[PDB]
């Protein structure tokens, strides 16, 4: 989606293996505020919104 009309996707009732995301080098920027990516595998969230 365009930045002015950025799309919002709701994530719920699923297992999120964030390692697959932060391990791949493809991403040039990966910056987590308030969280450490390693701990993502050991955490549960309420309202996940991509």
């Amino acid at each position: 989606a365009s930045v002015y009309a950025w799309n919002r996707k709701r994530i719920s009732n699923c297992v999120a293996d964030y390692s697959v995301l932060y391990n791949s080098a493809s991403f040039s920027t990966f910056k987590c505020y308030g969280v450490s990516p390693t701990k993502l595998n050991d955490l549960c969230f309420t309202n996940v919104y991509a």
Binding site: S24, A25, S28
Partner: protein
Amino acid sequence: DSFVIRGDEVRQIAPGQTGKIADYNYKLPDDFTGCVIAWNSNNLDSKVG
């Protein structure tokens, strides 16, 4: 310590970083003391094939 990586992974060569290189290839300590130097080598390490 000398090696070769790709540009996207240059960020991974630093204390407290994650990714393929940091986790599986080369890991700096959190209290690392010392310098990291990196420079492009496309003219030297790349081949047409």
